[PDB]
Amino acid sequence: QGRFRGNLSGKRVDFSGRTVISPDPNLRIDEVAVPVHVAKILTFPEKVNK
Amino acid sequence: KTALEMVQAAGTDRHCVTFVLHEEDHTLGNSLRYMIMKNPEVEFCGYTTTHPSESKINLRIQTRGTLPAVEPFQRGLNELMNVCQHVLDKFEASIKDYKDQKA
Amino acid sequence: TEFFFHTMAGREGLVDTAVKTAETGYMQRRLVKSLEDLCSQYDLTVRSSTGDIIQFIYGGDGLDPAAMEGKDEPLEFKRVLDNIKAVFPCPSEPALSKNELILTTESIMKKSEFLCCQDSFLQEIKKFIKGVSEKIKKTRDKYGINDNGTTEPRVLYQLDRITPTQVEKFLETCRDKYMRAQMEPGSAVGALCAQSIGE
């Protein structure tokens, strides 16, 4: 739990979640399903452009 | 907004068509599949479900010659309606004569 | 008694896995912390963070382990030749003999795009070409197939049928795969090695 191993090498971050997984073969291999509840919390900053 | 048509590609080919139907399930999909499969002018007929969460189905129809693949759809719908009317009348007559002979 | 012995074996396996988890975790931590400095440069020389060279060329040849089609080999010449024959069958071109095959191979390999390729891969290509040519010669000698192309039963040409178009396609595909299978500069090869040795 030191600074090198606990706060420099590996540290906690925001904009992340943890959830249980369930099978769904109807999605592509490169696609993952996200629930609406978590989707409303994790936000992405998009820059207003033309 | 319930049943919408889609061509096979940007070329707008009427041979292969896709009907996306909303608020439906395997019942009407399979019924119409069976009723239209007997059309000799249909090469390929197949219904599928996009995802069990959403209530929608996708039917795909490819004919033999130059059929728009829309007329077979209406043909199958009308044949299914006629079969439903006939079976309803037959069941009503059966129930009526059963009640008559029971008493 | 049998159930008790089976439970003993199960608990033995469980404790074995429990110890293995921590042991391999520590081993992986050490290996990664030690090998996280190496990287593949643009001059095909693997160097450390301080600039010292660990290898003049990765693996002695410089091929990507992730793009290794064969068993520690870049390509499987037999499978590639079969795929080329199947994907591009030319029915309007006659078959090639041993001498003609060797001649077209020597003429195509001496091009400019093949000069930058490694010599070992070219030697392996020559060996495979010689082998398939000897096989074709043995087949034609067994069935008396004439190289002039006037044998009455044409089906005999279907035993080992090869056309210059297929030869060129095979050579180009092999060259492209060998060029795209090399180590891409900038890849953290040390971390990949550590992970592949730890897992």
């Binding site: 900053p45 | 490819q62 | 382990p65 793009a67 199947a86």
Partner: protein, 348 residues
């Protein structure tokens, strides 16, 4: 201006399992919003994560930079990491309920009519596959009855449309290959595919699994790029379940019960083994027993008893495999290599 938009479809998202052994334990996928409360993904990607859907909690991270997003999508793309850097073997391939399904589908006994074949083919026409022609292959047997074999239906996955340039070619041996048929094995275990058309053999873990090279998806990846392999895997994952459910595959107590001949053979083998063990015990205790080289007499007796018990085990297993009839769910799942093996069957 900056707008903190919600997570919508198309956003690159990191998905990881906390216990990480190799780099493939974390991959950048494309997020799709769904009304449920769990993270769902194609099961073909379970082997990299080493997940089993038994309550495992996985982490999902959202990058906050366009450069990080692009790097995650390119380097950590699922389609770009279908193979491990350890030995190049493909990890993202078919899994249980997909190997068995493809096996039962490509069996020589499968013969589908026009309706069932068309249904199984349409079962995959979703998503990007909605803008392509079906290309119904010609039937094999047509004069007595128009029947489409299951191998053609499986090949349709490789080349669904006409404009698709995928031309898959493969020639390898299966798990139950005899070793002398050379594409004429009595069990039909020699996989031969030409121009994305299954000519011979039945699919199994050796061809659709993540075991080693010679995988059809591996050949597609190395010959026609990553997109073709991804599309083929999606089509397989969308087709095999539908057919497996329409056909029905179950296991019962009757699928593991022993036969009369099996019980007789087991009894005879146990008697013989116990007699030989008693003879060895009597020879060691009273008299001189042949001592094997490099070990003592007690270790020699131990080795001989272990050998006799292993003989009994293997003979009982062979008898159970020979007496078992085809269509047995355990035997089928052991043949196709989806799950289990002959040793587990013999033990149970």
């Amino acid at each position: 201006d900056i707008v903190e938009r919600h997570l919508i479809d198309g956003d690159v998202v990191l998905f990881n399992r906390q216990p990480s052994l190799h780099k493939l334990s974390i991959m950048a996928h494309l997020a799709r919003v769904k009304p449920h409360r769990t993270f769902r993904f194609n099961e073909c990607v379970c082997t990299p994560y080493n997940a089993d859907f038994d309550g495992d909690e996985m982490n999902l991270h959202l990058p906050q930079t366009e450069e990080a997003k692009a790097e995650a999508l390119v380097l950590m793309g699922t389609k770009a990491n279908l193979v491990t850097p350890r030995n190049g073997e493909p990890l993202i391939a078919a899994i249980q309920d997909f190997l068995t399904g493809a096996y039962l589908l490509t069996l020589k006994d499968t013969f589908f009519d026009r309706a069932k074949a068309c249904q199984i083919i349409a079962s995959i026409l979703v998503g990007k596959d909605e803008k392509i022609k079906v290309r119904l292959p010609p039937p094999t047997i047509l004069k007595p009855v128009t029947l489409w074999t299951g191998k053609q239906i499986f090949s349709v996955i490789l080349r669904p449309s006409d404009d698709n340039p995928v031309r898959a070619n493969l020639r390898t041996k299966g798990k139950q290959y005899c070793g002398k048929g050379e594409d004429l094995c009595a069990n039909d275990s020699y996989v031969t595919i030409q121009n994305s058309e299954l000519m011979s053999g039945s699919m199994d873990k050796g061809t659709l699994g993540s075991g080693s090279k010679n995988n059809i998806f591996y050949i597609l990846l190395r010959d026609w790029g990553q997109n073709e392999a991804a599309d083929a895997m999606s089509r397989l994952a969308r087709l095999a379940p539908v057919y497996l459910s329409n056909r029905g595959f179950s296991i019962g107590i009757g699928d593991v019960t022993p036969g009369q001949g099996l019980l007789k053979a087991k009894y005879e083998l146990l008697n013989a083994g116990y007699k030989k063990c008693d003879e060895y015990i009597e020879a060691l205790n009273t008299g001189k027993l042949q001592q094997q080289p490099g070990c003592t007499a007690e270790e020699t007796l131990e080795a001989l008893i272990l050998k006799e018990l292993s003989v009994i085990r293997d003979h009982a297993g062979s008898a159970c495999l020979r007496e078992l009839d085809k269509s047995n769910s355990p035997l089928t799942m052991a043949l196709c290599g989806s799950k289990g093996s002959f040793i587990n069957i013999s033990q149970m």
